[PDB]
Amino acid sequence: TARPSSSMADFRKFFAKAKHIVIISGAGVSAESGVPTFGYWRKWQAQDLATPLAFAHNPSRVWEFYHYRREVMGSKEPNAGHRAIAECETRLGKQGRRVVVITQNIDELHRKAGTKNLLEIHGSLFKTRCTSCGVVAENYKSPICPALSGKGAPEPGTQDASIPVEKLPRCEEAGCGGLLRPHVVWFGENLDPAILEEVDRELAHCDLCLVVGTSSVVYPAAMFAPQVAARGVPVAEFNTETTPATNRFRFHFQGPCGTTLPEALA
Template sequence: MRVTVLSGAGISAESGVPTFRDDKNGLWARFDPYELSSTQGWHKNPERVWGWYLWRHYLVADVEPNAGHRAIAAWQDHAEVTVVTQNVDDLHERAGSTAVHHLHGSLFEFRCDRCDMDYTGPLPRMAEPALEVEPPVCHCGGLIRPDIVWFGEALPDEPWQRAVEATQSADVMVVVGTSAIVYPAAGLPDLALSRGTIVVEVNPEPTPLTRSATISIREGASQALPELLQRLPALLK
């Protein structure tokens, strides 16, 4: 069986990772998300944007995968599992999932904003959140930025193509913890449904996907996912 998982902020929130709109320490609370997550905001004040993302980088490093992440990794013992995630953390990988495609980038990868070269050098330490932090400088003179997809930027080609391929080849698609409103990722379940694929939504709250999903489970990831594969035959009757 081939299982494709589309995960969103909800699964990581269960590990203590704030969702995007909540992920603003008091220092940044007065700023619009666009100021912190756009090329315009970066060019206007790279120190502020870097400070916010560096804080998120260290925040995520201190949390652990939850039962939902671990369950998805454990499915690999019984199925061919591909994870397509809108999240920028590494919790799926730390839980043990081996095929993970990040549609929106990663808090643990960095590149130069001028020459686009990957950056693997040291990062400033951050014991406490700081409103502004000087970004590292590349050998070409450009500033090092997080390898995150900001507002107005295109998704990276390779993860997106892998996501489409995984959706087209899936026997079952599990959509967990996503609002189903952020495109183009939100179009993947529709693609699966158009091919007759079973789509299981796991979310405590209804979403735009709820009406069209094959099954919609009103539970959190940690509650629903550990036994989902075993429950699936009964749920589909």
């Protein structure tokens, strides 16, 4: 029994031999890009809005929330942390070594940094799914629909837009007309089974794991690193604090991931 290590040299020793590296990322890695984690939007946190019940009973409020985040995000750029992860992958790929990013984030900032082996387990801010036809589609339009123009203001006290359901984003496929929702996995919903099998495949065979800027309170993502760790495979935690999963782990590196990751992945 002992506190987790704070030794960068010890971690780097493993990093040089690792052939299969898994990087699990949460909101923290993008909060360093000026990305608002949720952390309040008006009077609510993300867990109260990222729910099919919220959407069923006030879809306009939910769409305002997601509209705000889409518009804010578009003009955000990848940071040193995202970059270090991307460049690490690219460099190791030429050595025949695999680096894979499993992200709880829906901001696609890993995609913008150039990450190739990316598992977006909660979907994307910039994808829609039709609640009628089920079709999934990319959508970076600003604003996603006319009625949301100038809406989504985040200040407590801001009045609900109360957009009629017909004027929320609607499907344009084969004249469907169905109500669109964010293609994001919400609390109470299942992650994509196909994505989960791929996640399991990487976890079951990696020889090094990094869990990066995640609170590890969202399930089942929170169980990913401990699973790797329970194989005895070393796990390194990069955060501005400790987590409920921390003491399972080998290392804890305190501080911004923009500082600690470029060093660790050099």
